[PDB]
Write a protein that binds this ligand. Structure first.
Ligand SMILES: OC[C@H]1O[C@@](CO)(O[C@H]2O[C@H](CO)[C@@H](O)[C@H](O)[C@H]2O)[C@@H](O)[C@@H]1O
Length: 404
């Protein structure tokens, strides 16, 4: 009978690919259906390019794709409309914001699978050691704490010790980190939901200059090549006071044999001042049935299973990834394992989106402009003032004649 083939997540990032393959194999065993897992590269933008090869070919060789929150507007032609397959009551079990994000010109492109938001990981043991009682609320405080803890840990002999790690590589992950910097300085959303390209302002420029000032000082020089896992590995080995990353890093840091198990907490990222908005970039992944799948019925069944209460529960408990079902945030087992899901729920609800709705199918070009200009500041090639002006000009060219 049919073989249902899935491309989603990556064995190169944490446990997500291994866990995805496991969930797909469980469905195949439960239903008596043959399945195959196709692995993907680590970085989202690399996955998009890979999957676009299949889509350009109208290839039947993948039935189900795990797609990024930033993609519906790009991938919609390649998605089977799921709306007719779900009742209104079934669809209401997901966060409406994400269902809306995944709905493009009426087509429900994909089911919400897990959500995501950028957060601050902090070493609680080190804060205590150096006399700090709370994680930093401002970027200035983050810098001051990192300098002091770094000075002390270096003097005690840890050559590998840094104050802060984050994603500074030129790829989509840096657009995520940079939105957070800019928004948390009161510099706006780069491109506003109304279409206004707002990034050429002094607050955005200051945000980028500040981030440059970390490189080689409180963050490793090599941070400009770090994606999620490079940051996580310095952190997880016990070599960074602070890290910006997503929820998945938490369960991995708590695993038996982690050097940092029991030594960290999480909180909202810091911001420029008390009246700036909190910034947590919205992430998350969705489950799409290919428009080119020969087996839409079986594929939809697998997608419903993956997005079900019990599979999302397993994702939350074992992988610390955020459900897209509000009911799971009150589940006793979810919360006992990850209490911070409750503490940070308002951070997740107020997460700031990248400009994927307003850029639509041009989002990947916009993001590439953003990450390359931001990177030029991190590498010291340009100051923030020049980079935001240049970025404005680039985005204006990219979105000229685009209406939303
Ligand atoms: O494969 C899922 C896995 O990818 C991550 C990053 O490792 O996804 C987040 O980061 C991306 C940028 O690098 C965002 O585009 C995406 O929206 C966001 O979810 C993990 O957090 C996630 O478990």
């Amino acid at each position: 009978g049919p073989v249902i083939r899935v491309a989603g997540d990556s064995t190169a990032v944490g446990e997500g690919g291994r866990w995805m393959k496991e969930m797909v194999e469980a469905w195949g065993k439960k239903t008596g259906t043959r399945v195959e897992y196709i692995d993907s590269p680590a970085d989202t933008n690399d996955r998009l390019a890979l999957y676009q090869q299949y889509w350009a070919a109208r290839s039947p060789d993948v039935d189900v794709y795990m797609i990024d929150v930033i993609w519906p507007g790009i991938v919609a032609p390649h998605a089977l409309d799921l709306k007719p397959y779900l009742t209104e009551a079934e669809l209401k079990e997901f966060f409406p914001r994400i269902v809306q994000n995944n709905t493009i010109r009426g087509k429900l492109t994909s089911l919400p699978f897990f959500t995501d938001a950028g957060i601050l990981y902090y070493r609680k043991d080190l804060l205590e050691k150096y006399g700090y009682t709370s994680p930093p609320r401002t970027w200035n405080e983050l810098e001051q704490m990192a300098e002091r803890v770094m000075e002390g840990e270096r003097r005690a002999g840890n050559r590998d010790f840094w104050g802060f790690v984050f994603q500074g590589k030129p790829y989509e992950g840096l657009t995520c980190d940079a939105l957070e910097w800019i928004y948390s300085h009161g510099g706006g959303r780069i491109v506003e939901p109304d279409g206004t390209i707002s990034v050429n302002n002094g607050r955005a420029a200051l945000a980028l200059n500040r981030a440059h000032g970390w490189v080689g000082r409180i963050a490793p020089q090599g941070v400009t090549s770090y994606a999620e896992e490079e940051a996580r590995n310095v952190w997880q080995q016990g070599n960074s006071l602070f890290m910006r990353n997503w929820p998945y890093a938490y369960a991995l840091g708590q695993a038996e044999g982690s050097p940092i198990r029991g030594k960290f907490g999480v909180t909202v990222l810091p911001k420029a001042s008390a009246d700036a908005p909190n910034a947590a970039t919205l992430g998350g992944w969705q489950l799409m049935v290919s428009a080119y799948s020969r087996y839409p019925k079986e594929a939809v069944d697998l997608v419903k299973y993956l997005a079900s209460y019990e599979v999302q529960k397993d994702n939350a408990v074992r992988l610390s990834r955020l459900p897209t079902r509000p009911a799971l945030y009150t589940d006793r087992d979810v919360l006992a394992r990850n209490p911070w899901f409750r503490d940070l729920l308002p951070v997740f609800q107020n997460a700031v989106s990248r400009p994927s709705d307003v850029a639509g199918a041009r989002y990947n070009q916009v993001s590439e402009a953003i990450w390359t200009e931001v990177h030029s500041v991190l590498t010291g090639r340009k100051k923030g003032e020049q980079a935001v002006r240049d970025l404005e000009a680039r985005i204006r060219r990219i979105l000229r004649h685009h209406h939303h």
